[PDB]
């Protein structure tokens, strides 16, 4: 299964450079979030006005690295929810 082979350095999800992470504040509306972090590439489809920001890489075939940044809004688009995490390991 696990072997040395040129797995083509998959990138996944948005980019969460630390500066743009620090840009976010709880008082924002969806427009400010979109401006600061870019459009959410994973909008929550199942009812809740939740935006998921995922920053995932797997350089080569070793050391999966990911950040998950979860945002939620009221029906008006006003934000009050933040979860910020480094992901668990993979290969």
């Amino acid at each position: 299964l696990e072997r040395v082979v040129y797995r083509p350095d998959i990138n996944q999800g948005n980019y969460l450079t630390a500066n743009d992470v620090s840009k976010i504040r709880v008082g924002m509306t969806q427009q400010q979030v979109a401006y600061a972090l870019g459009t959410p590439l994973m909008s929550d489809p199942f009812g809740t006005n939740t935006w998921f920001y995922v920053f995932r890489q797997q350089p080569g075939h070793e050391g999966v690295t990911q950040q998950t940044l979860t945002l939620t809004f009221n029906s008006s688009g006003v934000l009050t929810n933040i979860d910020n995490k480094p992901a668990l390991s993979g290969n």
Binding site: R3, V4, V5, Y6, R7, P8, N11, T39
Partner: protein, 723 residues
Amino acid sequence: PTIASITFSGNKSVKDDMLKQNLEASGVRVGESLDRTTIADIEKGLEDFYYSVGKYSASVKAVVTPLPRNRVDLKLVFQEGVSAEIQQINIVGNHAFTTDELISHFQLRDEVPWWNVVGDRKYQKQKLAGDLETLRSYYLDRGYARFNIDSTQVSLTPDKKGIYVTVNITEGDQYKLSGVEVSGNLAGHSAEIEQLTKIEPGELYNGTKVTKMEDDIKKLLGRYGYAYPRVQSMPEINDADKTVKLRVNVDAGNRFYVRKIRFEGNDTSKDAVLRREMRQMEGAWLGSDLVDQGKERLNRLGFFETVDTDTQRVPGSPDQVDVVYKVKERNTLVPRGSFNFGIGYGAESGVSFQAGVQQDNWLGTGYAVGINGTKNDYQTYAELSVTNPYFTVDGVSLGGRLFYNDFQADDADLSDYTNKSYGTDVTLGFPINEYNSLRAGLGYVHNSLSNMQPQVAMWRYLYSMGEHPSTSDQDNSFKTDDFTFNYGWTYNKLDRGYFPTDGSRVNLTGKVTIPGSDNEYYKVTLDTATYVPIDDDHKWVVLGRTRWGYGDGLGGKEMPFYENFYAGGSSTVRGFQSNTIGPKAVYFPHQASNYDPDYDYECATQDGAKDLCKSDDAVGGNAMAVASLEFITPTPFISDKYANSVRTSFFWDMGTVWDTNWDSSQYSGYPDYSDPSNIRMSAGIALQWMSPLGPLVFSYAQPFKKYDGDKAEQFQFNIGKTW
């Protein structure tokens, strides 16, 4: 009235179709409403078109006849005298150069040099504008930052055929690039942008250099994911210092994300075979280099005649983009890749056939399959190959091939014997880099031999193998069980996967017998092809190709002859019978134990000589070296580079095969195969056409350097090879 037909005559092939377009612009058309008077009035518009195309001398006439109830048949007749010959290209105000240097870079010409008569000095206004821009780009490249093209003039003579063109220009002075300033939101990538900006302040200003600076800034911003940044370059100029400070203004914009990867035009190639060639992943920040590598991989795979890339901003969304790969499939719905009809044809008065299918469309499990059944010389050889280039999407390929082979020796340079061979190979291949592939494989072969006419080269192997056969007997039998560690190595980087233009391919194949195998030997093969765009323009190409091979016995058994190398086929060395090249099969004298009086079999002693004997037969060689240098050009025809992408080449081939174990000392009385300097050569013309059936190949190449017994054929034809 209405017109049953509109016809054009006298046209010297000058855009006949546009004549109908001119009428359409004039408001007339087949069956359209026009009368005789307006026809004469509109014919002036045809004169207008031929004036626009450069045929200023042209004038047009109309001929018409009504059908008995006012339905019209129309002919249009043209006068199209010589015109638009540029008798001069003049540049005035120039003081930095001799004009001849400037005009020589134009597409237009004043006097076509007899040294190389290319094209003709015929005027075309759009090309005049293009050449004006080339002149400006030359002056800015040389460094005259203030250069200006002022009121270009075009003149024709009181006899209209004579044209000459004048350009007034102003120069100022060439300016130093005293410094460069870059400003804007670079998103922290300033350090690398500066490395792009790096210049010695003593450097002379250069328009092309600043343009490439903008290009490379765009490139770097694209790699990190800024698809469409605003990039501006603006000069800051002082004429008293005669130097230019340079300003670059950049807005990195948004990090663009690829919402969709869309493949279009592949009506039969399953989407997976395109998508797994992607380096840029969907739902990830864009990488311009990643998308370009995806395009390059699609081209390299060779499945697709054309590959085009478009990046589209998602409608109404600020930063998301769709990436669209538009392709045209090879073989255009002819089933099973390129149908490999393999042929033996040329100057040789002999016939050979191969039949096979290739590539993509195969059933049930996503594999790619190749089949081949052949008779070559008097051999019978069949094989089945089953392959999956992606055994798992990580990139590791898996491949297994089965084959059966038979030998009968009714001349065709096939040495007198009867032999049967069959075997299998199981293969794995996993890329180690984007441009490297490494392979491992296990192979199994069994052989049985009979009617063994005695033969020194083969008998060297048989004698050393043990169970040494009895000389002078026409019949001897031998058997072999074989297991082999098949292995290989590859480097592949090519524009397209066919008719390449740039890059190189290196393919190394080698096998070694694992103990328990009877043969106890190893052999190595190297294949190499290199391409170069002439003048760094890929429309004009030159190909360098070489093959190398060696094989020796680990336990002193040298190599079994039935895995010896060969050359002579159009794939390896044009201009020879497929396997005639190299060492020739010297027989022993023998007493025809098994024989047929209907055959003049080589050197059967009851009829032939009673000593060691030459013949046209070839045993190949346990070593090989082959080289080819090729020159590629267009050749217009109703089917051409644009309509069908046909290729034609001028080339030279160098080929040589030698046996490392020929007893040069003991056998001084016969040709000494031990030295490779017995080089064969051939050179000439080759043609290739991607017919819907598959790649046809045509070539005439006289074997102008030759050795004893090489069965020449200055011309050769075949179809397929697929790769």
